[PDB]
Each structure stands twice: as C-alpha cells, then as structure tokens.
C-alpha cells in the first residue's frame, strides 16, 4: 500500500500472502473518502475468521473506470486488461492518488491494452505487444491503416478532472482449501487478575473460577493440566510462562 510506483493495469502485479497476521483496520486510514467494496464477506468481520492464502493485485486505473473492476461487469478494462470471476469472494480498495501519480507535463509510464482478439478469462495476464491487424490486409508490423498498436497511455495530468484522475486499486482475494488456515488476524488480550472468581479465556479455552499461583511443574511443551476427574485444573499463561 505504500509502494512508490504501481504496475500497469495490463501487466498487473500478483502477490501471494501466507503465514502472517493481518490487521485490516489500518486500511481505513488510507483516505478520508474511498471505496471499500467487499464481496462475499462483511469487512467488519474480517478479524475473526481466517484463510489459507491471500492474493493481492495492485495497479492504477482511471477514476471513472473503477466501476468496471467487479464481477459481472463489462467494458474495456473488464475484458481486455483485468477480468474478475463471477464466483469471486474478496475485497477491492481503490483510492485517489492525484498527489503521487500526476505530472504537469504528463505521466506516460502507465499503459493499458486497447485491442485484443478476444476477451480475458478470469485472472489472466496478456503481456503481448504484437501489432493488431484490424482489417484483412496483413501489415506485418507497421502502424498504418487497420493496424493499431494495442497499448495506449493514460496521459495523467493534475489539471484533469476527478473523472480522469488516477486511482490506485488493490484487490484482495481469499479462498478455502483443505490445508490449515494460517493468515489469521490479531486476537488482542487483557491484563491478568489473580485470587478472584472471574471468567477467563485461555487460547480459546473457556472457564470460570479463581486463578491462584500453582506449584505444579509442567514439561516445557505441556499446555493444560487435568485432574483425576478429567477436568481442567492447571493452565499455562500464553504470554508469560
């Protein structure tokens, strides 16, 4: 989210994320007003369940074209540069970046494909640069008549309106597999209290009772203690041993 330059929309980046703790709340501090559309999952309930892998795709698109990055949509960017599957679960975060990706002379480093033989399958990349023969005459690589280069440039300028200003877009995709979930968010904690009848939670283990200092000596790997009657009676504090 704090990278200096984002990849072009046609050659959109692909980042894999696994075995990490993700705090999505920070993503609410990007801009005072920004779109946070999420598909198949409520954003406020992203800190409890967790997934096996996360896919992040980042690029820059024109402001009025941001509506095409959604399942079931169509247009120019939707089928020629980046296609989203209909059975998609995840989130899209797009915010204005006019102060970082604008040149008075004009930004030409951002490119997008304009011509293609067919549409794009979901999650597909086309980085070809072959000339497009619009007509029937094969021009064999000269931009004459009925032969146009597939790529065009987003000539970004700060004097443009909001409908043409650049917008940075990051798409997060989640999924469920048989592999154990590993990308799980923070779980927080609370200060301990001793010698009083309280309700306690220890690593998902519920309980209610009085916590006292214990003379028992677990093995280093031991976590819980059970009595003769097969009930939990000794616990190891996850933070301090």
């Amino acid at each position, epitope marked *: 989210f704090n990278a*200096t*330059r984002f990849a*072009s929309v046609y050659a959109w980046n692909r980042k894999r994320i696994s075995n990490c703790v993700a705090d999505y709340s920070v993503l609410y501090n990007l801009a005072p007003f920004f779109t946070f559309k999420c598909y198949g999952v409520s954003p406020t309930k992203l800190n409890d369940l967790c997934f096996t892998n996360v896919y992040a795709d980042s690029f820059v698109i024109r402001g009025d074209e941001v509506r095409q990055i959604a399942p079931g949509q169509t247009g120019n960017i939707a089928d020629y540069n980046y296609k989203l599957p209909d059975d998609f679960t995840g989130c899209v975060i797009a915010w204005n970046s006019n*102060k*970082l990706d*604008s*040149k*008075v*002379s004009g930004n*030409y*480093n951002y*490119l997008y494909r304009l011509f293609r033989k067919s549409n794009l399958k979901p999650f597909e990349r086309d980085i070809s*640069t072959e000339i497009y023969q619009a007509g029937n005459k094969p021009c064999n690589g000269v931009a004459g008549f009925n032969c146009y*280069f597939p*790529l065009r*440039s987003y000539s970004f300028r700060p004097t443009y309106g909001v409908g043409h200003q650049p917008y940075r877009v990051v798409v997060l995709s989640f999924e469920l597999l048989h592999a154990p979930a590993t990308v799980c968010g923070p779980k927080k904690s609370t200060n301990l209290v001793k010698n009083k009848c309280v309700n306690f939670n220890f690593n998902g283990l519920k309980g209610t009772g009085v916590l006292t200092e214990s003379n028992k000596k677990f093995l280093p790997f031991q976590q819980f203690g059970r009595d003769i009657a097969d009930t939990t009676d000794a616990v190891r504090d996850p933070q301090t041993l």
Partner: antibody, heavy 121, light 108 residues
C-alpha cells in the same frame, strides 16, 4: 545489462546539420525511451529532447524548436538526433540516455560514452 | 520554466565522513526528482529517482529525503570513490532543467 554505443568525434564548420547515432543493445527494444543531453566543457548538463518510439511522442526543450529532431529505427534498433544551423557556442559532449517503462521514461537508467562535437572555421 | 539551485556549490569532505547536499526548486515540483554522480571525464550514472527510490546496484548508503521544493542527498560513511560532481534533475513539467553541480573534494 544494456550497452550503449555512440558515434565518433565530429568537427565541422558552423553552417551545416549534424547527425548523431545511438545504439542500444539488451532486452526488449519497444520498452525504451531515448533522451538526449548536452554537456558544455565550461558548464554542466542540459536536457534537449525525449522520444518514445513505441508511442510516437517527441518533446524538445524550449530553446531547441526548429533546430533538433530526434527519431528512431526499430529495424536497426537505434536512435538518431540531428541538429541544424550550428553556432560556435554549440560545441559540447553529447550524451544519449535510456529510460525504461519498468521505472520511468523521464529518468535516465543507462548512459552512453558521449560524442565531442566542435564547430569553428 | 522551473529554476532550481544545488547547495553548497563546493564541499570538502573526507573518507568515512557524513555529508549532505541540498537541492531546492523555485516552485513546487511534487516529488519528481533524480540524482546523478559524475566522475571527472566519465559518463553520468543514476543513483536515486523519485527522491526516495534507490537505483539497483548503487550502494544503500546513499539516501534521498524530500517532499517538494526541498530535497537532500545524504552519505553516511564516505569512501574515496565518492568524490564526484552531483547533479539534480527534476522531471515535473517539460523543459527538464539540471543543477549547478556540487563537486566534493578532500581537505588538503
């Protein structure tokens, strides 16, 4: 990675046009942008022009309208700049520079060895 | 056009020293700036573009810092190969101007 070769030293009378070549070798050619810079012996550097051959945009410095034109050939994979109506204060080392799409067109990633160009009588 | 100045014009530093060079534009140029070093008689080489991004192959010791109209390049531990002429280059709006060129030398 990418190697740049420029022409040789050029000595001429003021009243003619001079053509300077710049050959770049390495990687895909269509992703490169070509920039031309001056360096007078008695002062620093000064930019003249930038060309994007795949998109066809040429942009020259304000004091160089009508005097310099920059083009490129994809078959030879080279860039050329021609400067006409030379004056005595135009003698300098000419530098060819390359910018990459992955990165920036405006910045100069690789530099040539330069060509010394002098005009006198 | 954008007129910018690099300061100080002349600096004397030594091996292992920590040095900085300031570079200020006339009006706002956002954060579009590049820095180049030149050996005497050799070709220029890029070090930092966007005023924060460090070009691959250049030692990580060089550090750029700036937001707009004011930029600095900092060197932590100087080496004898660091003596060169330093030029700025802004590429916001056309007519890309260069700097005066700071030459860094030893104390005799």
């Amino acid at each position: 990675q990418v190697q740049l070769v420029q022409s040789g030293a050029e000595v001429k009378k003021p009243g003619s046009s001079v053509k300077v070549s710049c050959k770049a070798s390495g990687g895909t050619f269509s992703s490169y942008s070509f920039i031309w810079v001056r360096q007078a012996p008695g002062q620093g550097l000064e930019w003249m022009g930038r060309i994007i051959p795949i998109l066809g945009i040429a942009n020259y410095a304000q004091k160089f309208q009508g005097r310099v034109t920059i083009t490129a050939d994809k078959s030879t994979t080279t860039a050329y700049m021609e400067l006409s109506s030379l004056r005595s204060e135009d003698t300098a080392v000419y530098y060819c520079a390359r910018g990459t799409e992955y990165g920036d067109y405006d910045v100069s990633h690789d530099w040539g060895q330069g060509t010394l160009v002098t005009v006198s009588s | 056009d954008i007129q910018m100045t690099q300061s100080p014009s002349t600096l004397s530093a030594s091996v292992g020293d920590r040095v900085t060079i300031t570079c200020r534009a006339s009006q706002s140029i956002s954060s579009w700036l590049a820095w180049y070093q030149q050996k005497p008689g050799k070709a220029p080489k890029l070090l930092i573009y966007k005023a924060s991004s460090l070009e691959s192959g250049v030692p990580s010791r060089f550090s750029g810092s700036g937001s707009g109209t004011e930029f600095t390049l900092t060197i932590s531990s100087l080496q004898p190969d660091d003596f060169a002429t330093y030029y700025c280059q802004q590429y916001n709006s056309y007519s890309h101007t260069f700097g005066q060129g700071t030459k860094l030398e030893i104390k005799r």
